[PDB]
Design a protein around this ligand. Sequence first.
Ligand SMILES: [Cu+]
Length: 80
Amino acid sequence: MTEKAEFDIEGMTCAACANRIEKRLNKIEGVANAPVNFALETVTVEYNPKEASVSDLKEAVDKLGYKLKLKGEQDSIEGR
Ligand SMILES: [Cu+]
């Protein structure tokens, strides 16, 4: 089952910022994966909406400093 969720990240000026998110994300219970993509400025989070939630991990990202918001939820990304 699981779900894919796609989010736009603002402030992660270094790859270490991004990696720190991945670290936090991994620390959330019932996450599958969540590699942060340093080009499109987006992360594709994969998890189950049972033990974790988009809103929860949002706060977990905000906890690190940089901002996060919705982007999509079907391996799509979108942009110009
Ligand atoms: Cu950084």
